[PDB]
Amino acid sequence: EVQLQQSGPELVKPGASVKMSCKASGYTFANHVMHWVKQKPGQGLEWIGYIYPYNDGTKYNEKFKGKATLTSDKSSSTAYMELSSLASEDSAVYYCARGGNPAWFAYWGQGTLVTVSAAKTTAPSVYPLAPVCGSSVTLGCLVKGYFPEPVTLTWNSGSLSSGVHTFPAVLQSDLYTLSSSVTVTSSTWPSQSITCNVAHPASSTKVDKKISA
Amino acid sequence: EVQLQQSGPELVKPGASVKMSCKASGYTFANHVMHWVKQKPGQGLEWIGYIYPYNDGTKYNEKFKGKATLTSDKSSSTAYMELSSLASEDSAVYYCARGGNPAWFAYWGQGTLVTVSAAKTTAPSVYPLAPVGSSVTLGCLVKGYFPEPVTLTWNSGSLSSGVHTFPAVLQSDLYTLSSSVTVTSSTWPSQSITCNVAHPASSTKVDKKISA
Amino acid sequence: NIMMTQSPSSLAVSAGEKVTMSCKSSQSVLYSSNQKNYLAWYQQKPGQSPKLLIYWASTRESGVPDRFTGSGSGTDFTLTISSVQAEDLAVYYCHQYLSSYTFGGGTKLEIKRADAAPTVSIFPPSSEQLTSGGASVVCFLNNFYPKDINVKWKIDGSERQNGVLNSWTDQDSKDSTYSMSSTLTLTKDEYERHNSYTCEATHKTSTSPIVKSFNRN
Amino acid sequence: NIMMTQSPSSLAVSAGEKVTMSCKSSQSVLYSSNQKNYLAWYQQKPGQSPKLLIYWASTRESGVPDRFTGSGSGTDFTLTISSVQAEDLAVYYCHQYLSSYTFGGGTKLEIKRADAAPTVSIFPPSSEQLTSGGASVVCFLNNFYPKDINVKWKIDGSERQNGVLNSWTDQDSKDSTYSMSSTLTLTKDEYERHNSYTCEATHKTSTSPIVKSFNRNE
RNA sequence: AAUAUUGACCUUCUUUA
RNA sequence: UAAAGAAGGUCAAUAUUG
């Protein structure tokens, strides 16, 4: 029942600031501490600080003092994390974690990816993949040329979760490219509608490309 | 003009309790902390605990947790310490000392001697010691009393120079003390020299004039 | 304020066998008041957030399987998995919460599995991309083991090295196998100037390469 | 929670010379925030309460003479006295107040001084004690140096060893000399059965013994 | 109920401007 | 008056238990 829903991704220009949120539910907001954890790409975890919503009391990591500012809003039971004067080393994923007072981490959020770059947004181009012209068939969905990360992909709105392979995004020519595959039985295609759902929140893009013969 | 005046000595029966007071003056009693310290006869010092008179908070030494209780009275600027279930090891001098919050010891009281014993009290027997040129010595003998301490002064403190008070000596389950004072042959027998003794445990005080 | 050290960085075992990982703290994390070890273990699967496994060194959090078990006290601690499942592929961090909050380096767990041949499939450019002026040929290689694999593109029998984009996945949560995607991107003009397109795969499970091609027609 | 240890339990110097004492703590008493050493020195003269001398290891409290100076940092500290006065006779404790409150063992200071001959005085019993039935002969020996002295009572030339009570003082705060009192207690009956009473003291300042006597009704 | 802990408020102390 | 640190008290909560 305890859930922590964090805001979506954000692209920030160097030197600017940003403010993210963590909405709590399933417990007494003021009775527990809300931590914040950083994780650079391909690296480990790191503690930043925490807030006590009852009095809005702060406790920061020495290295993040002046970089991060924590606040809370009991009316919406939401905690906020503001980061100032962002730089290259600030690009990372940021989690919100509940504890006690203070206790240990016990519930995490999905995270919020942050990209610090001067480059501007670019929406992808989705393309369907079908065989040319056995007992199984494999279809694909190409997501080419977008910035920044991330991008979501779901086959048949999520009803198709077995036999799917989503490949990590690769950077090339200053743009990201992604791909995905799904395998089904020969009897399931083309006798059933198979469609690719793609969403690029930065560009507010949402496409649904059906795989045709 | 910070001054700490403690209460008089006490003779306590084993197993009983005792409470002493430390009256403060010359500063804001509430703003500063009042420590208490123990000093066994012939040994060093030992910290017991302290109290914050403003809100009456206390912090105790682990060794004196169930032995001491610290209270205060802001209306009279008086600190109190109570000892419970006294044994022989609790016989010692107990000081009160002021600091800050908590800071360090800055002012000390004169001390309170506590004697734990079931032996009855015995008041002393004072005797003037008179002689049989240019310099004469007179003495005063405090014989056979219990327990300690005893107070001895010459002419109610008016005579302080050239005085030798000797430590008490235990013998036959009783204490004995003596004191000497040297003056000029022109100051005695013309000018009166008197010995003043006091024994708190027996509630006695005597004035023995040194007569020729 | 207390430094954690996890060793080894990487570990590989077969599915269904035991594993043990170590966490060493510089100072002791045993608190004298409650006589508890302020140590916790967390799991992080690929693409997910951390998850609490164990706290107080040995107490297992509710909802966690019985395969995980914590042990140790003072400065040496151990996380054990009685039987490793394919889903257990993740990185595990040890955490102390007695003096501030510090994390360990993490330990990656790999699952050993039998050999598996890749399944290759090729896809010509889509009419959508063609009308836009581009042509991308995608080549999927799914569910193979071990991970060492080499792909080669050929146009009309001639090897091509430029304009290729490859991406690899981690071990699957159910199969513990690997997959790979390879895409070759050309212009619509050059794409229509050739007839044959080929995927050449090199894997340990076959001495000759796995080939998959299609001809414009 | 931090243990203090003073090296010189007892030490003696001549009047007018400098002195140095050490205090060693188990852990460091230097706080990093304010960069201060939580160490203090206290003096306790014979028969009095402690008195604050130095705090913050080197800061001298107001009203204390300039002869005392504190020094050190971390775990090794030293208290120095430029010129020893007769009043400086006392015991000195070092104190830590960073982690709880702990004291040192203390250091006793003795004052070396030139020789001094004893001044002896004898006192017959008082009419008060006599009416009660007792007789005590007191013998005062004041302001002598060194401290080594032996006193013996004689009745009509015969040495008596029982029923004697002796008490000694510490070095004087002005003279740095010693004093002693000797009391011989008998009953009035036995007291009136002899004529001469004498206390005889042996000291380094005289080759022959110091004699002081009185005769009953002479 | 007891111990311990985090934060806020209040009084006060300490090191500095 | 302002900054930092410390002691106690009250309040909300968390942890260890009985």
Residue numbers in the entry:
A (entry chain A): 1 to 133, 138 to 217
B (entry chain C): 1 to 132, 138 to 217
C (entry chain B): 1 to 217
D (entry chain D): 1 to 218
Task: Quote the paper.
The J2 monoclonal antibody is the gold-standard method to discover and map endogenous dsRNAs across subcellular locations and cell surfaces, detect exogenous RNAs in viral infection, and surveil mRNA prophylactics and therapeutics for inflammatory dsRNAs. J2 is exquisitely selective for dsRNAs, requires 14 bp for robust binding, and exhibits greatly diminished binding for GC-rich dsRNAs. J2 and R-loop-specific S9.6 antibody share a common recognition strategy distinct from intracellular dsRNA-binding proteins. (4) J2 uses its heavy and light chain CDR clusters in tandem to track the dsRNA minor groove, employing both aromatic and polar residues to recognize both strands of a 2-nt-staggered 8-bp duplex.
